[PDB]
PDB file of C-alpha atoms (C1' of nucleotides) in Angstrom:
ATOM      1  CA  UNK A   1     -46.587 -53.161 -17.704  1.00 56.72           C
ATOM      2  CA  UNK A   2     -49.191 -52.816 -15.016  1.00 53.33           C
ATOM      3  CA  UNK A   3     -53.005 -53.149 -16.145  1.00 50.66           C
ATOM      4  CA  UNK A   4     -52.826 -49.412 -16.491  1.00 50.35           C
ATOM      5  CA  UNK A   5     -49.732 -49.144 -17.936  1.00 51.98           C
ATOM      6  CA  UNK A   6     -50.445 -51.717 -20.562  1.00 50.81           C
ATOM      7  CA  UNK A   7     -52.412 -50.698 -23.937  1.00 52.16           C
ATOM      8  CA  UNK A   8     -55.839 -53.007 -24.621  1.00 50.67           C
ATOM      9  CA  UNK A   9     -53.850 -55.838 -26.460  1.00 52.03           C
ATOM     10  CA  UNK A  10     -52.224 -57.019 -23.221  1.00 51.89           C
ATOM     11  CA  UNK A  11     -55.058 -56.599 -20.786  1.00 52.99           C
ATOM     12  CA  UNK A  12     -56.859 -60.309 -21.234  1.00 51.90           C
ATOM     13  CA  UNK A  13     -52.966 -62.295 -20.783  1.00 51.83           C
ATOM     14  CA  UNK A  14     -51.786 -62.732 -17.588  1.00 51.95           C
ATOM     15  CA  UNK A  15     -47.808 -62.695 -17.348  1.00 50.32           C
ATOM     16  CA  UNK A  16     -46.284 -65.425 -15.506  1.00 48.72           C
ATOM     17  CA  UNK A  17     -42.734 -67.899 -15.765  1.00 47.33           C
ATOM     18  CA  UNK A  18     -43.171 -71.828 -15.165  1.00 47.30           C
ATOM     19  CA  UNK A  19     -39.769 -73.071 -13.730  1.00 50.16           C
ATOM     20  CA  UNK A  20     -38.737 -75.788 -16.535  1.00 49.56           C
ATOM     21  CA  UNK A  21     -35.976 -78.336 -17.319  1.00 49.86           C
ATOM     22  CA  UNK A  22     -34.035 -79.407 -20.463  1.00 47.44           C
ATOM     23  CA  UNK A  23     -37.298 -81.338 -21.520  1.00 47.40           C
ATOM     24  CA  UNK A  24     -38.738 -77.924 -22.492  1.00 49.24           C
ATOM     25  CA  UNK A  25     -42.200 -79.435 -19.454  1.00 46.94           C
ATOM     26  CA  UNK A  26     -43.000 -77.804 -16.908  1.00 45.70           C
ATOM     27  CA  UNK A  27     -41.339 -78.888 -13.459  1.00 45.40           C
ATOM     28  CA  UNK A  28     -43.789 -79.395 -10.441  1.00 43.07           C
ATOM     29  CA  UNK A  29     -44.098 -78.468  -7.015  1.00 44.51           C
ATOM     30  CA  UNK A  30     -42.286 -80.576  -4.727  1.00 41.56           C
ATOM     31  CA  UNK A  31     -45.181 -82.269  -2.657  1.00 40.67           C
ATOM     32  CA  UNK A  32     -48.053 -81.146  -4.665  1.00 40.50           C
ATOM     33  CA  UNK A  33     -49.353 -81.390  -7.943  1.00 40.57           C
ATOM     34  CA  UNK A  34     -50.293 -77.768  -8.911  1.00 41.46           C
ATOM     35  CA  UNK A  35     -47.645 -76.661 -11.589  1.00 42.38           C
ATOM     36  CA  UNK A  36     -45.175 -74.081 -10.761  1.00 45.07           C
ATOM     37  CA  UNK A  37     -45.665 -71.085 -12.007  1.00 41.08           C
ATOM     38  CA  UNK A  38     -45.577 -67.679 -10.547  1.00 45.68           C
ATOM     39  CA  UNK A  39     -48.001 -64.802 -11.461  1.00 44.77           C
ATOM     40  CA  UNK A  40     -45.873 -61.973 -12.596  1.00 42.78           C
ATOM     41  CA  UNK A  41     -47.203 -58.177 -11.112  1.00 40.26           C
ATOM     42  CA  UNK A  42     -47.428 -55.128 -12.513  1.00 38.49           C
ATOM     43  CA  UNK A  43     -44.379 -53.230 -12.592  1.00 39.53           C
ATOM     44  CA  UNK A  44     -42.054 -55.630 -11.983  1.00 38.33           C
ATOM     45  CA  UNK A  45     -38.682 -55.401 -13.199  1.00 34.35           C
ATOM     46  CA  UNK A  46     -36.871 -58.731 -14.663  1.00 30.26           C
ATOM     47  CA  UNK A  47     -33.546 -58.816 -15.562  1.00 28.77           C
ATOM     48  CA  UNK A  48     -32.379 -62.725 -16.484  1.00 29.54           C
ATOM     49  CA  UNK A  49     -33.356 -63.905 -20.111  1.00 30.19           C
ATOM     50  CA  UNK A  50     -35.456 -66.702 -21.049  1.00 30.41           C
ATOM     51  CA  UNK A  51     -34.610 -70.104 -20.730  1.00 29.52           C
ATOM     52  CA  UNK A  52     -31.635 -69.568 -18.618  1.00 28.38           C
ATOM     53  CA  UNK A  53     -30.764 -71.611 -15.499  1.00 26.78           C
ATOM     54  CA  UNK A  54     -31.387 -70.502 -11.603  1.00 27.08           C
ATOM     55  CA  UNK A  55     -31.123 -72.343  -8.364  1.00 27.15           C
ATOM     56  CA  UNK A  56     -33.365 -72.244  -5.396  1.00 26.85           C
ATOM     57  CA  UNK A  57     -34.105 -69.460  -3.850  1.00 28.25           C
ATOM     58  CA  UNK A  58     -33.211 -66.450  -6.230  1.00 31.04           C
ATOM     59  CA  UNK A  59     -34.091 -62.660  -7.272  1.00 35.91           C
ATOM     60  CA  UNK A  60     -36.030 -64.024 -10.713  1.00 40.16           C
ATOM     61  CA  UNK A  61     -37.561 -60.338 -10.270  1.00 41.40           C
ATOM     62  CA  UNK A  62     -37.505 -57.154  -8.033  1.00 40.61           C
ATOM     63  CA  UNK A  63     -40.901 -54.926  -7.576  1.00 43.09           C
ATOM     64  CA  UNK A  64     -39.994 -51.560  -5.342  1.00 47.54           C
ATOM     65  CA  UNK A  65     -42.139 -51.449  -1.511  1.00 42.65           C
ATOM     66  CA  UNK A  66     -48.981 -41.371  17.904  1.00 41.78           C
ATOM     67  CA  UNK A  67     -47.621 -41.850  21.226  1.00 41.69           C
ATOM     68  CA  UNK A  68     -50.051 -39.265  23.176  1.00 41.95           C
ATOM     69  CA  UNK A  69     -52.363 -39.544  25.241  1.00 42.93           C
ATOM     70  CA  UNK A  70     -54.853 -39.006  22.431  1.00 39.28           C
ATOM     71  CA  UNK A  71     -53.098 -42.709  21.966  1.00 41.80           C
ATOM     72  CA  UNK A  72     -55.204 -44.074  24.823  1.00 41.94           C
ATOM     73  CA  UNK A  73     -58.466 -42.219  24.468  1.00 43.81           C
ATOM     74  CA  UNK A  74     -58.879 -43.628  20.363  1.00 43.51           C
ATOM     75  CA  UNK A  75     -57.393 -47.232  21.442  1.00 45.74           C
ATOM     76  CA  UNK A  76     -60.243 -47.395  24.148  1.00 45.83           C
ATOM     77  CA  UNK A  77     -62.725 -45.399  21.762  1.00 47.81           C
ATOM     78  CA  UNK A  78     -62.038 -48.229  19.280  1.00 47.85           C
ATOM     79  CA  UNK A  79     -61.332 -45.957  16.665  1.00 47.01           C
ATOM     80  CA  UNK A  80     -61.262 -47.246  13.202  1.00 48.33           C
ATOM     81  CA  UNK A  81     -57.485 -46.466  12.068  1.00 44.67           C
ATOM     82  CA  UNK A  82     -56.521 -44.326   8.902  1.00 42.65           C
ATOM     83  CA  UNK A  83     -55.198 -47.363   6.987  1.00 42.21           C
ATOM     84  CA  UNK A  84     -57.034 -50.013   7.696  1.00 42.21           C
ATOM     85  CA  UNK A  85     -54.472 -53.365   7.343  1.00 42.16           C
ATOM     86  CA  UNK A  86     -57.243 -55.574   5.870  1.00 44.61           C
ATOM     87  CA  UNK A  87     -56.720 -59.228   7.048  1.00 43.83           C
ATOM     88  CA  UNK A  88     -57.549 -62.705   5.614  1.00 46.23           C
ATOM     89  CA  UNK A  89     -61.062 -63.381   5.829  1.00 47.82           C
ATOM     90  CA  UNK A  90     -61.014 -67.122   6.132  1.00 47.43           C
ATOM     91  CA  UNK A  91     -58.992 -70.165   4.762  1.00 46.32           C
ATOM     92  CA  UNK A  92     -58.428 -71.085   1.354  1.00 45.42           C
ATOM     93  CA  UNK A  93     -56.359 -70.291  -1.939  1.00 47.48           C
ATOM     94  CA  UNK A  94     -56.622 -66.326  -3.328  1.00 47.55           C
ATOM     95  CA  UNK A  95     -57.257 -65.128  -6.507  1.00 48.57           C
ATOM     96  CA  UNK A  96     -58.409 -62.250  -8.798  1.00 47.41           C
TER      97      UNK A  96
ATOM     98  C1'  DA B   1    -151.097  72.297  38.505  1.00 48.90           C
ATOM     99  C1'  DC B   2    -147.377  73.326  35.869  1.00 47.39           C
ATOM    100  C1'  DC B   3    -142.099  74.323  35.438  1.00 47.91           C
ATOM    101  C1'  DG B   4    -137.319  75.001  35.475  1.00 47.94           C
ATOM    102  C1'  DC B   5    -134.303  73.710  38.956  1.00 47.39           C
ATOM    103  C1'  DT B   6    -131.127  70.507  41.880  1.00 48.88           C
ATOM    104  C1'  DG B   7    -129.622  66.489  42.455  1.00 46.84           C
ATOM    105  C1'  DC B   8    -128.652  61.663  41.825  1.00 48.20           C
ATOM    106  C1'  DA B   9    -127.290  57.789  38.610  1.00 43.84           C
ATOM    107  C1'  DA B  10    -124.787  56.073  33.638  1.00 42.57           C
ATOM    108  C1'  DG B  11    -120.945  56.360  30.676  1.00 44.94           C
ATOM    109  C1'  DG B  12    -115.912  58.370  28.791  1.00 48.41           C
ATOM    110  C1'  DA B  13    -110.103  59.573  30.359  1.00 48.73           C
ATOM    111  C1'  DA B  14    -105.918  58.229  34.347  1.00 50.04           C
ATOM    112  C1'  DT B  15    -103.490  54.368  38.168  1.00 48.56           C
ATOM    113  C1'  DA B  16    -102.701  49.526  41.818  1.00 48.71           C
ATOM    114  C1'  DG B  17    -103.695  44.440  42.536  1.00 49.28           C
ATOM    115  C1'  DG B  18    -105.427  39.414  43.064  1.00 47.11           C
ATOM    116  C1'  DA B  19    -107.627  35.489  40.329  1.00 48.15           C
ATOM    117  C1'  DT B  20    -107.345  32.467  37.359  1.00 45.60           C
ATOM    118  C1'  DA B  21    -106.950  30.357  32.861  1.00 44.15           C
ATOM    119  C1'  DC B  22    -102.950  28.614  30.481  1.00 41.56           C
ATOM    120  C1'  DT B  23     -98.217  26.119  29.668  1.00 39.85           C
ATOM    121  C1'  DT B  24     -94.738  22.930  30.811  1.00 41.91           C
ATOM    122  C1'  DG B  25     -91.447  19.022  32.334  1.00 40.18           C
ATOM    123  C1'  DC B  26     -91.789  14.945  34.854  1.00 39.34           C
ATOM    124  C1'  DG B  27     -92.418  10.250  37.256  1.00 41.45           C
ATOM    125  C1'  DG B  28     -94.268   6.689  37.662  1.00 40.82           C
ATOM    126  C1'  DG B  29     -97.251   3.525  35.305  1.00 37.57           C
ATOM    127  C1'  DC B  30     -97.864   0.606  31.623  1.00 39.29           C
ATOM    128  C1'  DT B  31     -96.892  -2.877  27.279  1.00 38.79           C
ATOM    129  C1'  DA B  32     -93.824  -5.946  23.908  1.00 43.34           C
ATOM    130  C1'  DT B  33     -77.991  -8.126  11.307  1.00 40.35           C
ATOM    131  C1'  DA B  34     -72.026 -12.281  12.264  1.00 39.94           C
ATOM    132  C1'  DT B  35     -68.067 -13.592   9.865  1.00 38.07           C
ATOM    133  C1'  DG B  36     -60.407 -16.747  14.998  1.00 41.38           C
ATOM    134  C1'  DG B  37     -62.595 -24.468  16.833  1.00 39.46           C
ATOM    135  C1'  DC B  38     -61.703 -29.220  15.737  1.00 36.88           C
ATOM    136  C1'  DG B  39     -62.876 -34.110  15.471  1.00 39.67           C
ATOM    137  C1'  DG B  40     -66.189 -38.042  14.960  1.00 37.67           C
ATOM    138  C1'  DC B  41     -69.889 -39.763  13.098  1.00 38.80           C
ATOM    139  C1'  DG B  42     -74.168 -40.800  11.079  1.00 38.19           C
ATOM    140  C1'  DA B  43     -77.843 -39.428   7.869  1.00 38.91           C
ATOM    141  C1'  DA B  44     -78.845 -37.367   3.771  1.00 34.80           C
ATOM    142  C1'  DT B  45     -78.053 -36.396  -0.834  1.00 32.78           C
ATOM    143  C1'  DA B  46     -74.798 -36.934  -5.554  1.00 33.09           C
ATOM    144  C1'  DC B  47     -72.975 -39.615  -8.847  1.00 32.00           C
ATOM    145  C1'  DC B  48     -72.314 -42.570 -12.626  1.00 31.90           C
ATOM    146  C1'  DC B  49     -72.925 -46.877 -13.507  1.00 33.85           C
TER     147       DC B  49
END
DNA sequence: ACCGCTGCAAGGAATAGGATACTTGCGGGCTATATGGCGGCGAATACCC
């Protein structure tokens, strides 16, 4: 459930799945030391169960996705565009 | 040496005719309340925290 599809009670958790091994621990990142696990998003649709083995590189989830010459005069106008593609400000790790 | 008379002006009724006060349209001279276009953008409010 999204934030606004979920009720209050879920609202402080944040969802997520730690890739483990028979040891019940939870398996690293090859190279680095920040445990695996990914951040689940709203509305994403799971269909393997808990617990249940995977290999590299699999669906663990799915989540759904002029020419004119008025083309010249906003390109050279510098136009700000109707949906603006915002970019990555500078370097580092992301969060929310 | 006095008087009634004739006669010569002043005011009434009928016609023609110009002068002149009155009326009018103008010509120039003057003064002094809409309703089928968008797009961009930046400033100025609105808003609900």
């Amino acid at each position: 459930l999204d934030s606004a599809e979920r009720t209050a009670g879920g609202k402080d958790l944040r969802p997520a799945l730690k890739i483990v091994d028979a040891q019940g621990n939870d398996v690293l990142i090859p190279g680095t030391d920040m445990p695996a696990q990914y951040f689940l998003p709203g509305k994403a649709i799971v269909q393997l169960e808990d617990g249940v083995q995977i290999s590299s590189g699999d669906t663990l989830a799915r989540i759904p996705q002029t020419g004119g010459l008025p083309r010249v005069a906003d390109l050279f106008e510098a136009r700000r565009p109707k949906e603006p593609a915002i970019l990555a400000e500078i370097s580092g790790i992301v969060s929310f």
